Amino acid sequence: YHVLFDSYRDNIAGKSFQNRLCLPMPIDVVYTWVNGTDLELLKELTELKRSNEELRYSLRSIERHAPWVRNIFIVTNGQIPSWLNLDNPRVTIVTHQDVFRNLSHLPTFSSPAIESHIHRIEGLSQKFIYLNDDVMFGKDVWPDDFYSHSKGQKVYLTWPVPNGGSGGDTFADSLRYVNKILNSKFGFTSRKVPAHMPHMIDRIVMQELQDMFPEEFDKTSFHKVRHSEDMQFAFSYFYYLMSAVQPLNISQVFDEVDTDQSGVLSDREIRTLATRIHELPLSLQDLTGLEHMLINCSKMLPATQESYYDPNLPPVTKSLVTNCKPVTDKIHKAYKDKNKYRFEIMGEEEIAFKMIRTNVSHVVGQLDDIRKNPRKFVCLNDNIDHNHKDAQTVKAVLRDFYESMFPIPSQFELPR
Amino acid sequence: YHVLFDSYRDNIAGKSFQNRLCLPMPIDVVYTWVNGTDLELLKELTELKRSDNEELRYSLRSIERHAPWVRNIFIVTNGQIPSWLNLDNPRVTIVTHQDVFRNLSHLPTFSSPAIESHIHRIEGLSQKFIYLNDDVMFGKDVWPDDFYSHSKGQKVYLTWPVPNGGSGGDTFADSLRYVNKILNSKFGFTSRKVPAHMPHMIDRIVMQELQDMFPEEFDKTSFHKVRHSEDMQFAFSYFYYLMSAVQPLNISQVFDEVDTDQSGVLSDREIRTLATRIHELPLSLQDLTGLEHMLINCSKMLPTQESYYDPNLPPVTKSLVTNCKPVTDKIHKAYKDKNKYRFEIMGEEEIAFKMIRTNVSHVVGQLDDIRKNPRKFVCLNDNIDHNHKDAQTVKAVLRDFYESMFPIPSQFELPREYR
Ligand SMILES: *[C@@H]1O[C@H](CO)[C@@H](O)[C@H](O)[C@H]1NC(C)=O
Ligand SMILES: *[C@@H]1O[C@H](CO)[C@@H](O)[C@H](O)[C@H]1NC(C)=O
Ligand SMILES: *[C@@H]1O[C@H](CO)[C@@H](O)[C@H](O)[C@H]1NC(C)=O
Ligand SMILES: *[C@@H]1O[C@H](CO)[C@@H](O)[C@H](O)[C@H]1NC(C)=O
């Protein structure tokens, strides 16, 4: 009963470090589902005139390989579930009326507009995982695969934007436009496309991005069809995480310098302050000049006897160091800008970006590649020519692979 | 309240994953300290004729300030204790050799490796602990993640490979070559590196398995009361046993990973999965036909949802796949023996290694660089000649550095004789 509390309270400090040892919990999952049959196609056709079965196996992968998620949300245009189980209260369907701030955009018919407003679902945990109904987990995946406290959120990158793009691509042009925006805002940098995977997102960082970039997100959500200059959901979040700048708070610098927590620096702490300010090697002249500028600032600005080197040195405090312009400028010049969030970068180590080209000889090869080498993230986008004699056979073998991977029943299905 | 209990078990699976998501806790700290007292000097003089910096008090402050999540601190010493130490504090325990060595004939150990090889056998010790050599201290902020991670196992720190040149070395390279030859005879030959001198995370189970796998060498190194070429080092042996331990393959594990249905019988899909796991791409119909031929032959030589492409196939259960010699041989050839313990390797990114050569400007530069760029682990080797007139100056400089880095008295000390 009290053993759980006492175990984390049993250290030399007597504190509790659950926020640093047990990861952030709980974690939710957000999917997306669209049905291209009958009414939706009719709406698209009339809009043009005026102007498969992957989700089940994805949820089965959620049950099998990632059993640490709390809730599953599926965003729909009002399409009621066809095989989901609503008796279990751990899965719910959220209509776009909730995510949209304005009801005039409910005929979405576009993916970035849906993806931009995910973080406004009520009941969502602090961090949530986003899957686009063509990805799944093929190996045991744990939250430390996405986020570790010491090295921050984990970012997976892939081919660079200019190299992997091509002319005449609607999606490539949007990524280039987002690149232009971020290079004109945070400065020029080499950018790499995030991997197509079940990304992990944080509500706080995304909301900060919303507040920082309201007009552009509103503009890209305004479009009713996928446009050439939309903003990607994963790339924006990840690169804002990378390039988030934090102001240099001098008070924390002094707090870390002043180990006594007494607010006054002894003769030994000026050594640490000067060495953090200065660059190697360090001569006595620089330290004497630091002491001289300190006394000059104390004398020019009107204002337990610790012994110092120079008796002309008055005791130094926060009210002195923070209001001393030369030392603050020297600290700012010395201390580089530090990122507000931490991150770790890797590549395509365990990501199965498999492409279906409507050639069963190659489809079976790709599936065998997946089967021999199990991977944590699998991408199986359904690209079929549908005008080929053996096109149904590709779907048949793909569904055979799906059945092979996850044949066990899941509780999120009606026992028909 | 029900919410407090359900918070850790609120999930789809309904199971508590605390043993995996909450890191290995608790963790203890062990120290090896010795003092140059009159009795120790007299016993050393007697042994040879027959045949202090007080860095502990500052490492304790470093543990208190930078590593507040440790549980207990154990120190092993030759019966002597500092006067300032707070023995009345029920969180630091002095440990004598009467409960460390298996035999009482080595109590005049007088050699660090003998104590090191047995430091893991103290009663009440946590399954994982951090080894402190009384000269290394912490910095920045240290968490169990800096030593161990569940997804990647432990983290081993390697500085630079052993030279193997020979024709030199007094008492350090010889022990490295000794352990190197032992591990070459046991696990094979490879280019090995010397672990960094730093606080090391040690497992009691792995250490016990190491001691039960090389028992003769370890009672030999416990035999030597003076450090010699014939001793087996602590960090080198532990880390390379962890990095080179292997386990024989168990057919049940692969049989269960290929049995996605968890039914005990393999359909065509599972047979294809096994075939593509064991064989190389591009898999063709010939390999599957040969596998089915081998299956039917091994069946002839001796429960719902049943369907097969070939009617000759009996239900492929654990019995039929476990006892088939040639396909088990091909399975072993495909999936070799892997390491039993996970590990992670990295270099010299965040380790501080400083030496004092009595050249005052360079030791001052070293400590100034430590101050400028704090690092997680600091190692200050003291080998001052003590005949240079600046020995007291170096002592004062090191005292100044230690006091500046940790001026606050620790919970393990009695504040006495102020200033
Ligand atoms: C700087 O850190 C101090 C620490 O005492 C804190 O009180 C203060 O709010 C911080 N300032 C800013 C602008 O964040
Ligand atoms: C599939 O690719 C192979 C590559 O060797 C080619 O020979 C074959 O014609 C392709 N099949 C189809 C149906 O395009
Ligand atoms: C090895 O396989 C056997 C098969 O009977 C199983 O019972 C046992 O638990 C396995 N042992 C290990 C150590 O994996
Ligand atoms: C002492 O150290 C300095 C580096 O700070 C070096 O230049 C000098 O040559 C060294 N030796 C002597 C004898 O001064």
Author numbering:
A (entry chain A): 6 to 56, 89 to 340, 351 to 463
B (entry chain B): 6 to 56, 88 to 338, 350 to 466
From the paper:
Replacing S1 (233 aa) with a 29 aa linker sequence corresponding to the S1 region of the Dictyostelium discoideum PTase and deleting a large region from Notch 1 (N1) to the S1P cleavage site allowed for shortening of hPTase by 680 aa. The S1S3 structure comprises an NTE motif of two short α-helices, a large catalytic domain (the stealth domain) formed by the four conserved regions with a Rossmann-like GT-A fold, and a C-terminal small helix-bundle domain consisting of the EF hand and the three-helix S4 domain. Moreover, the EF hand interacts with CR4 of its counterpart subunit, thereby contributing to dimer formation. S1S3 superimposes well on hPTase and zebrafish PTase (zPTase) with an RMSD of 0.63 and 0.75, respectively. S1S3 has essentially the same catalytic pocket with the catalytic NDD motif in the same orientation as other PTase structures. However, while hPTase fluctuates between an active and inactive state due to an auto-inhibitory motif that moves in and out of the catalytic pocket corresponding with the closed and open nature of the S1 domain, S1S3 lacks both the S1 domain and the region from N1 to the S1P cleavage site that contains the auto-inhibitory motif. Thus, S1S3 is likely locked in a constitutively active open state, consistent with its kinetic parameters.
PTase is the key enzyme of the mannose 6-phosphate (M6P) targeting system that is responsible for tagging lysosomal hydrolases with the M6P moiety for their delivery to the lysosome. First, GlcNAc-1-phosphotransferase (PTase) transfers GlcNAc-1-phosphate (GlcNAc-1-P) from UDP-GlcNAc to mannose residues on the high mannose glycans of the hydrolases, following which the GlcNAc moiety is removed by uncovering enzyme to generate the M6P monoester. PTase is an α2β2γ2 heterohexamer encoded by two genes, GNPTAB and GNPTG. The α and β subunits are transcribed and translated from the GNPTAB gene as a precursor molecule that is cleaved by site-1 protease (S1P) at Lys-928 to generate the individual subunits, a critical step for the activation of the molecule.
